[PDB]
Ligand binder design. Structure first.
Ligand SMILES: O=P(O)(O)O[C@H]1[C@H](OP(=O)(O)O)[C@@H](OP(=O)(O)O)[C@H](OP(=O)(O)O)[C@@H](OP(=O)(O)O)[C@H]1OP(=O)(O)O
Ligand SMILES: [Zn+2]
Lengths: 369, 135, 506, 499
């Protein structure tokens, strides 16, 4: 019995990055369509985001960067040369028809979601378009142009004393951990995969620099981590973070990019694992903000996210997929839950124990709230 | 991780004096296209949508938006079903066939597909492509 | 230890002992002819030899000397079926340890070695017969590695007779070949281009008075295999921006053709050829996890599982010794040199991490010898946190998983391309000088090439093709050397010419 | 390794068998001294018959290859024992002899007569490893008859160090003048009164050996006494630490010789030649000027590390610093050094695998970096067992293909040719790097340190229950662990013992 809102503009799945690029925003639409057939939209306040004007996109990012994103187009690429080689935009984050409207849309949804969230209207705020956690203050990085999460948290810090951030994605949210690397109001807990891997940062030793020391949890993992291990390491650490830090609002970046088989994955989770994660985080009775970001096998992202929204509400949903518009994309079984693969996990228990004890040792040194 | 002035975000420090009055200085951001209701039983909604698909061209969503357009009154929306139409953006013979020529003599450079479908933009080309790969 | 007390008593073991006895015998023995006690006379020569070194080296002389016969403590011995020009090499081997092997007088030594139970020289004459196995002496080396009970040289001498059965049907040796041998060369997988049906029928029609009711189980045992005579050229065409994946199906000899094409929208940071299937790795973006798999009979790209690491200029090695694609070394995202080994079970689409290298390299030329991956040169971590051209040799052992740098180094250094051939590793780098590397003997031999710039090696089936990158049209931009005569000829027929070779695979 | 160009692996090349020397070695080892076949010559020792081969005896030695080629009987050797020539045969054939202290000197004779080079050299190493005051003036004579410089020095150091204890024996009585000149004219410490022992030697004959007497008193090099075994220890409530020195007495007794409480905070320290160099805010260095009490200043480190290992090298007159943590818990592997006089730190090659808190010990050149703790899986550290030799001259560091019988934090003491390692209790390993082996002892019974004064191994218990005198004197020949004293200090928790 908890009110749930949902942000989705029927126009985000038309922005196409390039030919042969891992991120295809179309997955959002597919997710939407499943939510339109499971029966999970009768009972969820559906909104439409506002096109985020470039005057709130500046309260974090620099001005020349936003002017660059607003003034670039694949026809006049030759005119802006040193500009695009200085803002990283061009090779990993390609220019494409749209771009700044995509950023307006994701950022508008996330920021508006926080604005409604801190006014004690709804309790859970869903937005699977935003959550771009690699973008930085004056440059793009890792498929991400603007950093929706830091704008949403900059919006939440107007009414809340302390804000928690949770990273489930395979990668290290280095943009939102960097943006809050000195302050101690926001605490960034990030479970990731640290070996030689994107983005490279995210060690166990880099914590906080300045006032916000001991206020940045990085949990480095290894390949092939199955579900039971990820639960046994997710529950205690987050109970300790809730006990020691005492937040007021939670921002979950439920990245569906750590499942069984992605174009770019490496773990070995399943959908019910992420479901248990979002249910555990949901069971603290705090203003919660679910985001997206990450996930490059489209059908598994749609399945994962639609079962996530099935967890946010309360309703159980069957395995059989009802008639949508994309059966030609879902495999020859037409079932929701996927199964793990054959990959073995190289994090041998006592690894998780030593890391976890290091984390507890770093968490017992926070002052009272 | 980098530390400096142009790397981190400038967090505003906390003064409780502003946790009350701003609650109306920034209104609701975004349209409200649908909201649940306790009065209308979802059986009449299942019938409403089944009629909106069988007896009319609406789908599994525009029936809900149009139902909210009249403040949860089924009969009025039923009265306004023949008025508005589900805009049939019909890609006719020349449209689909020329699109197949662009996709068979070009690929996924929709900017080039635009150089033989100059009337349509790009969002409708991409929207038609994902709904076209089914063949 | 518990009783050995270095101030009371202990067991001094001298480990420089084995060389002082050997260099004692090869210098005091075969020089001053001192202390001789047996005379081995062969085809008219008296040899003043010792019984202690001949017996401590070959059990044949151990059983011939310590015997109950009459010629035990007499003196002169007269050996039979051996010449006085081979037994001198046997003396130069027993007393010294260094023999000068030549392809002229080889089989004889082989035979004689097997009669004297000199195991090491027999194994090296067997490997050196496995190298120089022609198409003419392929039914005589087969018939020779059979009366000596040798499975290695029999398999090597049978593969060539199998993959050259077309131009072997009319030879008068293939008509006298007995039933077991033909059963072995047929029941193995003769290609369709080698038309085996009319080969067996051509065999039966000889002494059919006694062979008709004796050669039908042969036809019930005939097989057929696909085509693994490929090159797989991957280079960026001068026209568009995508890179083709040309497949070169070589004919019989002195001609290479072209099968089909595929192209790819992505870039490539590494690529390998596993069992006739193509495996490319990398993406034009900054997530170079991705990996694809191509084949001439699908014109598709069956995506495979992504790597667990983001490295470029790493080293993909293959060879189905146990079905796995290895990725050794590489240069990371922040321009650091990694030294981690990850492998890929092709039958499972699963990557796994094994023991790491001892020196981090990037761009090393890897070559798999029957279950051992060799990392050759590449690029090494300098000292001022820079890089430098490397000379190292590394020997990852894909059976016990244990790599270790070889003590010696290469002649040249830097960016090199190498291909395995028969038993050796042909390496090319700084312009025009290919060295053939023998990892068993730990030695090199140069060869020199035309003076007219990079080069790429691909040992196709029987020969060694040498493709030069910059197709400047004027040059014949493709060669073919015979490693026994160093005769660099010119082969033609590239048809769909490229312009910038990135990878020339096996 | 050589890129030959005359030979071709497909036409003509040269074969080079690697397992040849071995195969012939175990060939002669096997079918000779087991079945006794092809017996050639017969050698008679005392009254025992030895059926031996001429090719092996001629291969190993030159005495025999010159005896057999003298251009047909049982040749008899007239000055060897029946039980020593057996060791000589078991060495010439098998190459693995069982040494022993009772029939050692005998071998030193015969192994030189037969010109067995390796057995003579190692017999010399094991003969100079166990020279005591009882037999130094005889091992000098033995080293002088056979023209051995290495063992003459090791036999002369013990003779001039303990000079007062010998000035009234009898081996010192009939001593030739050349040996005495070699003893006194190299640096006799003043603690044994060299001036009186000269005239004491003169009165043994008085009338004859007096022609050079006055000129013999103008030949010695009397030198002041140094200092042994530093104890930088933390005693009493705070008060920093100390720097207690221990003047050694040749009476099974150690003595204190002035403290030096002037300390701040120490991370590491080492003893060079005869003074203390200390490092400890974390990259400085002071010197212990004990003659004038005061410390002194030196150059700082080019970097900053924690728990690094300082190894003193009097050969090159330098100090190497190896390994250690770098503030943040990441293990480093950078070897630096400090030249005394030039007073400028520099840099050398890096270690193979990084390690911190190890125990370094140099053997006349090569520095052995023992134990420590190496990083593991995946961010942390584990107690290692690795052995590393850092060749101080060629600048080559490489790991030994074997590990210790224990792991963790340990303390080592160079003694003679051996390295006495000790660690976490009921253990005392005696590592010999030349022939690559370990020999464990047994100790009475808590970490404890080890130190080598001159001819004994003083082992120190670094923790007291106040009133126990846990400063054991270890004689490793008989594993005799005694309890010495004479120390008059209340030093409680001592950090480390600088030998
Ligand atoms: O599974 P693959 O053989 O690697 O093919 C994929 C897959 O295409 P299919 O429709 O044939 O499965 C992607 O489709 P979705 O997973 O997104 O449905 C498609 O992406 P888009 O068509 O949506 O762009 C992508 O194409 P691209 O590489 O151009 O992004 C294409 O890859 P290939 O080009 O390797 O076939
Ligand atoms: Zn991700």
């Amino acid at each position: 019995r908890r009110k749930v809102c949902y942000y989705y503009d029927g126009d985000v799945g038309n922005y196409y990055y390039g030919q042969g690029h891992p991120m295809k925003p179309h997955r959002i639409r597919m997710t939407h369509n499943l939510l339109l057939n499971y029966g999970l939209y009768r009972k969820m306040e559906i909104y439409r985001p506002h096109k985020a004007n470039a005057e709130e996109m500046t309260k974090y990012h620099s001005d020349d960067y936003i002017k660059f994103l607003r003034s670039i187009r694949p026809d006049n690429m030759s005119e802006y040369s040193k500009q695009m080689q200085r803002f990283n935009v061009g090779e990993d984050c390609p220019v494409f028809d749209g771009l700044f409207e995509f950023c307006q849309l994701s950022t508008g949804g996330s920021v508006a979601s926080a604005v409604k969230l801190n006014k004690q209207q709804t309790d859970i705020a869903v937005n699977w378009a935003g959550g771009l956690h690699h973008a930085k203050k004056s440059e793009a990085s890792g498929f991400c142009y603007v950093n929706d999460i830091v704008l949403a948290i900059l919006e939440l810090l107007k009414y809340h004393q302390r804000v928690l951030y949770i990273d489930i994605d395979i990668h290290h949210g280095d943009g939102v951990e960097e943006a809050f690397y000195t302050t101690d109001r926001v605490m960034t807990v990030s479970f990731h995969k640290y070996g030689e891997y994107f983005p490279g940062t995210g060690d166990l030793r880099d914590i906080g620099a300045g006032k916000g020391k001991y206020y940045a949890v990085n949990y480095p993992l290894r390949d092939g981590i199955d579900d039971e291990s990820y639960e046994a390491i997710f529950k205690p650490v987050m109970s300790k973070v809730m006990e020691m830090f005492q937040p007021s609002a939670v921002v979950l970046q439920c990245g569906s990019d750590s499942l069984s088989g992605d174009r770019l994955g490496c773990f070995n989770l399943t959908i019910k694992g992420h479901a248990k994660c979002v249910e555990f985080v949901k069971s603290f009775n705090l203003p919660m903000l679910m985001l997206g970001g990450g996930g490059y096998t489209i059908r598994n992202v749609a399945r994962c996210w639609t079962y996530e929204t099935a967890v946010a509400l309360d309703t159980e949903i069957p395995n059989e997929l009802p008639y949508n518009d994309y059966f030609e994309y879902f495999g020859p079984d037409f079932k929701l839950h996927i199964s793990p693969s054959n990959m073995t996990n190289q994090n041998t228990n006592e690894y998780l124990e030593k890391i976890k004890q290091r984390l507890f040792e770093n968490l017992r040194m926070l002052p009272h709230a | 991780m980098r530390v400096g002035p142009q790397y981190q975000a400038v967090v505003p420090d906390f003064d409780p004096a502003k946790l009350a009055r701003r609650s109306q200085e920034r209104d609701n951001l975004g349209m409200l296209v649908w909201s649940p209701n306790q009065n209308l039983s979802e059986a009449k909604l299942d019938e409403y949508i089944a009629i909106a698909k069988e007896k009319h061209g609406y789908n599994m969503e525009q029936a809900l938006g149009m139902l909210f357009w009249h403040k949860h009154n089924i009969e009025k929306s039923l009265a306004d079903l023949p008025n508005f139409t589900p805009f049939p953006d019909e890609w006719t013979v020349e449209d689909k066939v020329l699109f197949e020529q662009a996709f068979s003599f070009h690929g996924k450079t929709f900017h080039r597909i635009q150089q033989m479908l100059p009337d349509k933009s790009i969002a409708s080309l991409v929207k038609f492509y994902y709904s076209w790969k089914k063949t | 230890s518990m009783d050995e007390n270095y101030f009371v008593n202990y067991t001094f073991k001298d480990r420089s002992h084995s060389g002082r006895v050997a260099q004692g015998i090869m210098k005091l023995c075969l020089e001053e002819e001192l202390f001789a006690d047996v005379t081995i006379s062969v085809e008219g020569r008296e040899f003043q030899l010792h019984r202690l070194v001949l017996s401590a080296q070959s059990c044949f002389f151990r059983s011939m000397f310590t015997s109950n016969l009459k010629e035990a403590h007499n003196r002169v011995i007269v050996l039979q079926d051996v010449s006085e020009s081979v037994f001198q090499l046997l003396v130069d081997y027993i007393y010294h340890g260094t023999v000068k092997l030549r392809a002229e007088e080889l089989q004889e030594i082989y035979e004689v070695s097997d009669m004297y139970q000199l195991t090491s020289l027999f194994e090296e004459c067997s490997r050196f017969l496995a190298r120089t196995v022609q198409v003419g002496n392929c039914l005589q080396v087969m018939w020779l590695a059979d009366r000596h009970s040798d499975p290695e040289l029999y398999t090597a001498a049978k593969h060539c007779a199998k993959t050259h059965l077309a131009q072997l049907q009319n030879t008068e040796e293939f008509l006298h070949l007995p039933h077991r041998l033909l059963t072995d060369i047929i029941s193995d997988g003769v290609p369709c281009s080698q038309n085996p049906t009319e080969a067996i029928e051509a065999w039966i029609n000889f002494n059919k008075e006694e062979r008709e009711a004796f050669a039908e189980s042969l036809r019930t045992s005939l097989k057929e295999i696909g085509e693994n005579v490929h090159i797989y050229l991957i280079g960026k065409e001068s026209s568009r921006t995508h890179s083709l994946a040309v497949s070169l199906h070589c004919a019989e000899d002195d001609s290479i053709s072209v099968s089909g094409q595929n192209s790819l929208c992505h870039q490539i940071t590494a690529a390998c050829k596993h069992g006739g299937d193509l495996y490319v790795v990398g993406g034009s973006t900054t997530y170079m996890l991705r990996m694809w798999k191509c084949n001439n009979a699908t014109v598709d790209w069956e995506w495979c599982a992504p790597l667990p690491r983001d490295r470029l200029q790493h080293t993909l090695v293959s060879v189905p010794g146990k079905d796995a694609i290895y990725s050794l070394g590489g240069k990371t995202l922040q321009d650091t040199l990694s030294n981690a080994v990850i492998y890929y079970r092709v039958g499972d689409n699963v990557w796994t991490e094994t023991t790491q290298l001892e020196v981090a390299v990037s761009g090393a030329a890897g070559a798999n010898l029957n279950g051992i991956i060799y990392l050759l040169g590449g690029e090494e971590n300098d000292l001022d946190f820079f890089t430098k051209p490397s000379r190292l040799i590394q020997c990852f052992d894909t059976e016990t998983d244990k790599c270790h740098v070889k003590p010696y180094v290469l002649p040249f250094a830097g960016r090199m391309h190498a291909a395995v051939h028969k038993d050796l590793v042909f390496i090319v780098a700084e312009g025009d000088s290919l060295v053939c590397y023998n990892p068993l003997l730990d030695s090199f031999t140069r060869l020199c090439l035309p003076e007219a710039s990079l080069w790429k090696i691909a040992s196709c089936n029987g020969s060694i093709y040498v493709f030069r990158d910059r197709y400047k049209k004027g040059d014949a931009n493709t060669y073919k050397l015979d490693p026994a005569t160093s005769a660099v000829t010119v082969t033609r027929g590239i048809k769909v010419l490229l312009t910038n070779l990135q990878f020339v695979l096996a």
